[PDB]
Amino acid sequence: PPRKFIAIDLGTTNSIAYIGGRGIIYNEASVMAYETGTKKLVALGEDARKLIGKTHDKIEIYTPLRNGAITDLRIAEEFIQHIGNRAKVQDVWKGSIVLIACPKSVTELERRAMVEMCKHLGADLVQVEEDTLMAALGAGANIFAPKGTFILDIGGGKTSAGIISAGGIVVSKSIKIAGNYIDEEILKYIRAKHTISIGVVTAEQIKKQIGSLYKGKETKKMVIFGRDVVTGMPKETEILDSEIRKLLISIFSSITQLVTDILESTPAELAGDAVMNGLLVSGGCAQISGLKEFLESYFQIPVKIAKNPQTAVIDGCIAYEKEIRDRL
Ligand SMILES: [Ca+2]
């Protein structure tokens, strides 16, 4: 009987967990809530993230991962244990093979601590890899070839970019300008320009429905509702795709600067791959309309949007099961 394979994409806003033979058992916010002063779990994932607004006083909300940052290693273990509890199987960790994908900001100390933590839970083997390496494999890139792979992952709380060659990361950097920032900046733009406060969900909907980085085949506008800034009264206004496009382009100056920084670090041996093969784009924001065209216009290299951008990291972990088992 083979050892169970467990993959955890720690993620930047949501975590995703996969168990061999079960599939993906967790995919939502990296948040948990307890009755105050206890470890009595009242909500996990989305059910807990909702309450961040005004939590019931007899309830404490914990955020083990804030934009991909580990807030506390003991709190991170609680969260990992809650994920494994989803399997509803006694001793899910015993003798298992565990792969954890994490942002590069997770220090070597924290990665080694998570290895000891999972081994203490019962794992036979624990391996920690960077999310950009797994995202490229999940999105369909041959990360094991000596050819240069150039990856950009726009998630919820981090945007990362890197160069991959021969199964490993050659260089990678990350910034804080990502999906959550974009939603909040849409909110702030509409408050300043239309004197109405919208909720985060309306901001996300604006992004999805009419947001773009490049002038497409359809001109759209949108009716939205929010709180009038002066009076507080519910108020309606129309938002044009052109003003949101201008806003998104301004935000993405940070993301094109990140790609420029990575491209400026390309070794001479891989420069041809950058020019001829170009960029692969994954993450939740990879589906912003016109992103391919916007990036191709700026960098004059090919850009490819991943087929599975929302799940590239965990899909790569799932594909990486063979490599771990093979090399064993
Ligand atoms: Ca800017």
Residue numbers in the entry: 17 to 344
What did the original publication write about this model?
MreB is a bacterial protein belonging to the actin superfamily. This protein polymerizes into an antiparallel double-stranded filament that determines cell shape by maintaining cell wall synthesis. Here, we studied MreB3 and MreB5 in Spiroplasma eriocheiris (SpeMreB3 and SpeMreB5, respectively), a model organism for studying Spiroplasma swimming. SpeMreB3 adopts a canonical actin fold composed of four subdomains (IA, IB, IIA and IIB) and consists of the same secondary structure elements as CcMreB, Thermotoga maritima (Tm) MreB and SciMreB5, except for the C-terminal region.
The crystal structures of nucleotide-free (Nf) SpeMreB3 and its AMPPNP complex were determined at 1.90 and 1.75 Å resolution. The Nf-SpeMreB3 crystal belongs to the space group P21 and contains a single molecule in an asymmetric unit. Nf-SpeMreB3 forms protofilaments along the crystal a axis in the P21 crystal. Thus, the protofilaments are arranged in an antiparallel manner. The interaction between IIA and IB' (with and without a prime indicating i and i-1 subunits, respectively), which has been observed in CcMreB, TmMreB and SciMreB5 protofilaments, is not found in the Nf-SpeMreB3 protofilament, whereas the IIA-IIB' interaction is conserved in Nf-SpeMreB3. This IIA-IIB’ interaction is mediated by a hydrogen-bonding network and is stabilized by an electrostatic interaction between E285 and the N-terminal end of the α-helix starting from V216'. Nf-SpeMreB3 had larger ω1 and φ values than SpeMreB3-AMPPNP complex Mol-A (4.6° and 3.5°, respectively), showing a wider nucleotide-binding cleft and a more uneven overall conformation. While our Nf-SpeMreB3 crystal structure forms a protofilament, we suppose that ATP binding is necessary to polymerize SpeMreB3, since filaments were not observed in the absence of nucleotides under solution conditions. Although some intra-protofilament interactions along the filament axis were observed in Nf-SpeMreB3, the interaction area is smaller than that in SpeMreB3-AMPPNP. This difference is derived from domain closure upon AMPPNP binding, suggesting that this conformational change is necessary to form filaments in solution.
